[PDB]
């Protein structure tokens, strides 16, 4: 499982964004419809791929047939079968957050997951609320503004 994380990270400009994969890092910035989820080549993914049902779920690397691979997303055969849940999010190789469907259950609330601060640094000053989601009633922690 842990060997199934696409880890093709590349800091073309040494801006320090890659530190957020191991730990939160002092960060500040002034500058701070999605397409359907298809098959994402693992070569262009850096870090875990999260999908929301609306609960966050880690999607590891698999081949195009769905068999789990354990090559850290370095082989060309490794992809992410994301066509199913409501949306997925991940980091590309050059530090851009990719979405498809994302974790926005409300125009101002978002599902909270371990790598939210990394994928969406804009939401660092958000408050975590235990909100209720109607899908059956599901309750989950959400970072809201």
């Amino acid at each position, epitope marked *: 499982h842990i060997n199934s994380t696409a880890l*093709n990270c590349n800091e073309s400009l040494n801006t320090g964004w890659l530190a957020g994969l191991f730990y939160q890092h002092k960060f500040d910035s002034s500058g701070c419809y999605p397409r359907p989820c298809g098959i994402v080549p693992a070569k262009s993914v850096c870090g875990p791929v999260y999908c929301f049902t609306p609960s966050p779920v880690v999607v590891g690397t698999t081949d195009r047939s769905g068999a789990p691979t354990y090559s850290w997303g370095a082989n060309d055969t490794d992809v992410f079968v994301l066509n199913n849940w409501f949306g997925c999010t991940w980091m590309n190789s050059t530090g851009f957050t990719k979405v498809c469907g994302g974790p926005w259950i409300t125009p101002r609330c978002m599902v909270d997951y371990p790598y939210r601060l990394w994928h969406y640094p804009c939401t660092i000053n958000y408050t975590i609320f235990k909100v209720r989601m109607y899908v059956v009633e599901h309750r989950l922690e959400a970072a809201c503004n």
Partner: antibody
């Protein structure tokens, strides 16, 4: 500040293990590598380990006879070099990197932020 | 594989010392500069070819990309007598330069 063990003297073919402790509390670093410098040569990278993923990388001169570990609870790194030869007489340094700059499955590289004072390992008969 | 020329240097205080680091192959901006005072642990000066590390005074300045790199220590002071070496982190294995021992005149 990184503090390393005292100097060592070993017979050829033996094994040496060098520790690397942190002066203060454990801090944020993603990888632990080891570097040595022979008396007439420049600095040489030996290997490294990224504890979060459990992956390791070695140089070809050390494949099969080197083992690098990093205890995150205590903040103490380790390097055991086996099958020692006289070419291994060098000052061995301990490094810890804080900001990764490139990751290839499943290892991550970058500049070395903190260095240890060094440990002389002499291999002689 | 990195190459540093010259191997030694001798510059007067308050002047400018220029060091070089040639790369046999392009390493982009994945290069770091270090300072090793005699009998001390090496100290990171520059990373990313041209970015100073935290706590590094502004008189240290690095530049270059691809295969050519240059470290510049302006307003040289006696505490700058040390060995400086470059390191690339663009490809495995990680390689260091031969070093450049600097003597401060007086």
């Amino acid at each position: 500040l990184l503090e390393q063990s005292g100097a060592e003297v070993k017979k050829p073919g033996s094994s040496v293990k060098v520790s690397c402790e942190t002066s203060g509390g454990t801090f944020d670093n993603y990888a632990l590598n080891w570097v040595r410098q022979a008396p007439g040569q420049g600095l040489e990278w030996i290997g490294g380990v990224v504890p979060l993923f459990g992956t390791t990388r070695n140089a070809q001169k050390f494949q099969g006879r080197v083992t690098i570990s990093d205890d995150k609870s205590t903040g103490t790194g380790h390097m055991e070099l086996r099958s020692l030869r006289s070419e291994d007489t060098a000052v061995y340094y301990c490094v810890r990197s804080v900001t990764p700059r490139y990751c290839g499955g499943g290892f991550c590289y970058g500049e070395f932020d903190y260095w240890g004072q060094g440990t002389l390992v002499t291999v002689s008969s | 594989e990195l190459t540093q020329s010259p191997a030694t240097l001798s510059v007067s205080p308050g002047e400018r010392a220029t060091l070089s680091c040639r790369a046999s192959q392009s390493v982009s901006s994945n290069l770091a500069w270090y300072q090793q005072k005699p009998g001390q642990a090496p100290r990171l000066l520059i990373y990313g070819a041209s970015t100073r590390a935290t706590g590094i005074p502004a008189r240290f300045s690095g530049s270059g990309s691809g295969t050519e790199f240059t470290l510049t220590v302006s307003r040289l002071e006696p505490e700058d007598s040390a060995v400086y070496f470059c390191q690339q982190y663009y490809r495995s294995p990680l390689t260091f330069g031969g070093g450049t021992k600097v003597e401060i005149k007086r």
